[PDB]
Design a protein around this ligand. Structure first.
Ligand SMILES: Nc1ncnc2c1ncn2[C@@H]1O[C@H](COP(=O)(O)OP(=O)(O)O)[C@@H](O)[C@H]1O
Ligand SMILES: [Mg+2]
Lengths: 270, 278, 370, 188
């Protein structure tokens, strides 16, 4: 039961992070019983659909899905066309169009291309939102790879409206491939998940959109720095620890008096 | 549902895509998801052998030292393999990775003077550069001509520090005077999963040529081209890691925008106005 | 008697090995005349080095020979070393072995030309080159810990385990006190003050050393600075004018934690320290978290220890004990560690003598020296 | 500076009304030399670069080499005692403080605006100086429109005639609510 679900999670966790959709497609025909369970618990690359009314692309997730149709953020319509679907309020839609404009500018500044989507809905006291960002590489400029990012924000108001509580959780999936003469091929991929909580003042000088965008921007910069420094750096260190230039029986020739220096310095300090 | 042959094929696909070091966890996952032991032990039995022949698995035999490499080039049939240095044949257990029944074997004397000269220098090279390195040298005739195959492997499985790694390298040349073509395939696979997950897979194909002479000189030339290929491959990997954040990672997400500052969220229209004037 | 010389990007700290304090601390600048000389009953030189430049900077153009840690001008570095050996120490370099300092993760030709100049022009019996953060850890009475060395040109995060620096975890940030001086010059234009000349750059450096500090919470400090004038401070200029700064006191050092203020891609010193710790093995991370050591003059802001403690406590796991050591003498800590290292008994056989340089050439420093 | 160096030939201008006369002389007679030392040599060698100007009282003055020494201060600010670099070096430092992948488009799209960019030798001199400072494989194009004396106003009319600028104004109610500090919030 749950042990099979945990085994499937631990199985597809240690699979290569470039063929996630293909590996998930031929994993679900093994046991087609927890198909509804793991699809709400694993991380997948996003899907792109096109709004024919406005001529813009928009991303597909489980927070704009009504059975099988998906609500577009630009035109506020479903595709395939249904009736009496799940809709935000007028204040929430007025918030959502500003959020989509602001995060479109965010995606233009930081990603220089790609698809961004923001979806909002109401809660018991505040409002929650999901920000999806997808960028694939440019094939004309010889770039192979993809970036996917999901951010979930929960906002709780405090009646008067002077300050509010924000809670952010983020998941970033990434892969890259370079083909060079000296290195051959180079594939690098993986995923990170982080959380954050913060109370912030809300006024005319700083509305909700600025606070949410600031938190998402700081989280994305932190995750990019962590991916470049900690994880790829550890992979580089493992590569240098497997095979080594500056031969192992020959690099100990310049580590002879260093032991004596260290031991007399520990004598001096004690 | 789907037929059991399709399940066997996709289980073999899952097994052959396993990272280095993580075999028993993948085996536990497939044996707990399939819930059918009889179709897994014998329905997909070449998958384990194929994984061990691809990952260059070192096996410590009883008695002699210098654990041998399980390749597809030294396959004897009925789960038997050979040791070119020990002149022996053994039976390998893929499930428990255990060596048994070490029966002696005799090889032909043609590929002997051209094998030990390469083997001694290759063991010297692997001891000289690789820390936990193992190496094997095969010599056999395929296209009407004897050829030499070299296999180098190094693994550093550290599950408590949440990472595993593997270097594999294969080299091949057909002995034919006065010159021959060397072909090498170099593979690296690294997994690191401390708080998230990151994997690296890489390979390189290197083609060069060498002159043919007596055994010691051509062994030294083989070691020299192996050194001058793998050193440049590792240095190029390091230099590629140096310039990741400015060339390839910038093509997906920049660290800062082109304004070199954070976004002023009270001035979104001031960013949007500047692109409307052609 | 050995000689310990710390040639920083903004100051030179030189003295004899065995003393507890440096004997010559002077700015590393070369000044040249800018105007027309009309009086002939005067000394009338062409280059002024050190304090003589600072006493004559109103008619001088000042040049720093070191920019961002690396040496750009070698004639001016020769002038700095000549003034150090013959005018500030009154020593003869033919009789004394000289210890030298070098920032980590530096080009090798800098060490090559350093050894070539010190052996061919200022001929010493022996010389050695050491890493600055390792000496700063040695001066603090410990052999395991992480050193945050922030000076005038570079900021470095170096972890050292059992007296050996870990080169795969050394982090370099190209932001230090010179960038803070230039950013303060940029942000003093909002209140109407114009500082352009190289002489006025020293005035703004003095303002930064005198009045700036590190806010514990930046947004709350900016909120309190915009509510009342309880944070405004006054400074008297050399010509008698009085200036007043209210919120530039804590915005200028915030570039250490938010490097995008001057347009730099890298992360702050807290994230840099956390990345340098997190690249190490798990069994030494507790010792590296417990032994954070500050170094250099740019760590002399009177709010930096508590802020660094708060940020590293936020980044680290909650069961980890964070202790940050900020010694009161950390403006002179590379020199004290060099004095400790040069006065050791077994260090005397680690000197690169002149005969080995003759038999090897300008490449021995990559084999006998770190 | 032209007012100062006009005293070498004996022409003394002191009052604030005469500063307008010296400005008119500068607008009519000054130019930027391609090479300064060769221009000084040919000015000293021959009386072929001299020009004459008529004062409001009918007196005639003549300037030979003050024509190109006055806008040489834009390229050599040490003539008036300033330590700063020239406008070409300021341009090269502004380009070198940008991202490395956008410097080609910045080097190809150098735009000169304002009234002090109206000397009839300044584009070729700036091209020569920037091409000296830039690397040898880069393309340098300097654009000086003929109407560049009024270029801030034309772009201001373009910006004020746009549909998406009508939300960027600072209204009166916003000034009443926020006081005279919203201009640091709504304007760059
Ligand atoms: N009290 C202070 N507060 C802030 N910064 C200081 C203070 N004292 C010195 N500094 C800065 O320290 C820098 C140089 O310190 P130090 O590391 O001793 O020299 P160097 O960087 O040349 O090694 C100077 O740029 C100066 O701005
Ligand atoms: Mg220093």
């Amino acid at each position: 039961s749950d042990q099979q679900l945990d085994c499937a999670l631990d199985l597809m966790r240690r699979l290569p992070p470039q063929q996630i959709e293909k590996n998930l497609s031929d994993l679900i025909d093994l046991v087609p019983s927890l198909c509804e369970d793991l699809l709400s618990s694993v991380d997948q690359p996003l899907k792109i659909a096109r709004d024919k009314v406005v001529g813009k692309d928009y991303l597909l997730c489980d927070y704009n899905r009504d059975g099988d149709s998906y609500r577009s953020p630009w035109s506020n319509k479903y595709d395939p066309p249904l009736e009496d679907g799940a809709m935000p309020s007028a204040r929430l839609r007025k918030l959502e169009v500003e959020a989509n404009n602001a995060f479109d500018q965010y995606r233009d500044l930081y990603f220089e291309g790609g698809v961004s989507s923001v979806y909002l809905w109401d809660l018991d006291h505040g409002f929650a939102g999901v920000i999806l960002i997808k960028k694939a590489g440019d094939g004309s400029k010889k770039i192979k790879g993809c970036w996917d990012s999901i951010h979930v924000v929960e906002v709780q108001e405090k009646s008067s409206g002077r300050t509010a509580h924000y809670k952010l959780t983020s998941t970033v999936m990434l892969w890259l491939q370079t083909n060079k003469s000296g290195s051959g091929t180079m594939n690098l991929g993986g995923s990170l998940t982080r959380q954050m909580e913060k109370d912030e003042t809300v006024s005319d000088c700083s509305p909700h959109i600025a606070n949410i965008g600031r938190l998402v921007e700081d989280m994305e910069n932190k995750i990019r720095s962590t991916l470049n420094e900690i994880y790829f750096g550890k992979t580089k260190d493992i590569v240098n620890g497997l095979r080594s230039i500056d031969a192992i029986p020959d690099n100990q020739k310049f580590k002879q008096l260093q032991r004596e220096l260290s031991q007399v310095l520990t004598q001096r300090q004690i | 549902r789907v037929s059991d042959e399709e399940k066997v094929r996709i289980a073999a696909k899952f097994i052959t895509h396993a990272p280095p070091g993580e075999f028993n966890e993948v085996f536990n996952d497939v044996r707990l998801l399939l819930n059918n032991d009889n179709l897994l032990r014998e329905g997909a039995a070449h998958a384990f052998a194929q994984y061990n022949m691809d990952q260059f698995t070192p096996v410590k035999i009883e008695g002699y030292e210098d654990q041998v490499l399980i390749t597809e080039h030294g396959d004897l049939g009925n789960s038997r393999f050979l040791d070119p240095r020990n002149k022996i044949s053994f039976k390998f257990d893929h499930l428990r990775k255990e060596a048994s029944d070490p029966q002696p074997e005799e090889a032909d004397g043609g590929l002997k003077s051209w094998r030990e000269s390469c083997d001694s220098a290759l063991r010297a090279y692997v001891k000289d550069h690789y820390s936990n390195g193992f190496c094997t040298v095969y010599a056999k005739t395929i296209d009407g001509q004897q050829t030499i195959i070299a296999c180098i492997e190094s693994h550093q499985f550290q599950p408590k520090n949440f990472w595993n790694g593997r270097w594999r390298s294969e080299w091949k040349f057909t002995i034919t005077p006065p010159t021959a073509q060397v072909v090498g395939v170099l593979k690296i696979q690294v997994h690191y999963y401390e708080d998230g997950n990151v994997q690296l897979v890489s390979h390189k194909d290197v083609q060069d040529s060498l002159t043919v002479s007596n055994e010691a000189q051509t062994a030294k030339e083989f070691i020299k081209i192996i050194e001058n290929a793998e050193n440049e491959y590792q240095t190029a990997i390091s230099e590629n890691y140096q310039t990741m954040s400015d060339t390839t990672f910038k093509a997906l997400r920049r660290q800062l925008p082109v304004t070199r500052t954070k976004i002023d969220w009270n001035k979104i229209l001031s960013y949007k106005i500047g692109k409307e004037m052609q | 008697t050995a000689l310990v010389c710390d040639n920083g990007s903004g100051l030179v700290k030189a003295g004899f090995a065995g003393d507890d304090a440096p004997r010559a601390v002077f700015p590393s600048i070369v000044g040249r005349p800018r105007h027309q000389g009309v009086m002939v009953g005067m000394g009338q030189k062409d280059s002024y080095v050190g304090d003589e430049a600072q006493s004559k900077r109103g008619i001088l153009t000042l040049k720093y020979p070191i920019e961002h840690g690396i040496i750009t001008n070698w004639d001016d570095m020769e002038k700095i070393w000549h003034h150090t050996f013959y005018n500030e120490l009154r020593v003869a370099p033919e009789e004394h072995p000289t210890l030298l300092t070098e920032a980590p993760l530096n080009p090798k030709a800098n060490r090559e030309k350093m050894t070539q100049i010190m052996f061919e022009t200022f001929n010493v019996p022996a010389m050695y080159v050491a890493i600055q953060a390792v000496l700063s850890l040695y001066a603090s009475g410990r052999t395991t810990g992480i050193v945050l060395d922030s000076g005038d040109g570079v900021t470095h995060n170096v972890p050292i385990y059992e007296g050996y620096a870990l080169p795969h975890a050394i982090m370099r940030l190209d932001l230090a006190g010179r960038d803070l001086t230039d950013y303060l010059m940029k942000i003093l234009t909002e209140r109407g003050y114009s500082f352009v000349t190289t002489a006025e750059r020293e005035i703004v450096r003095d303002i930064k050393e005198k009045l700036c500090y590190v806010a514990l919470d930046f947004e709350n400090e900016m909120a309190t600075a915009a509510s009342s004038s309880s944070l405004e401070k006054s400074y008297e200029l050399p010509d008698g004018q009085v200036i007043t700064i209210g919120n530039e006191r804590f915005r200028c050092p915030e570039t250490l934690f938010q490097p995008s203020f001057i347009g730099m891609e890298s992360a702050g010193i807290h994230e840099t320290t956390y990345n340098s710790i997190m690249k190490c093995d798990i069994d030494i991370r507790k010792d590296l978290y417990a032994n954070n050591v500050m170094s250099g003059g740019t760590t002399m802001y009177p709010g930096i220890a508590d802020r660094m403690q708060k940020e590293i406590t936020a980044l680290a796991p909650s069961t980890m004990k964070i202790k940050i050591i900020a010694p009161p003498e950390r403006k002179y800590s590379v020199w004290i560690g060099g004095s400790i290292l040069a006065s050791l008994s077994t260090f005397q056989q680690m000197w690169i003598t002149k005969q080995e340089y003759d038999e090897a050439g300008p490449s021995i420093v990559h084999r006998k020296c770190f």
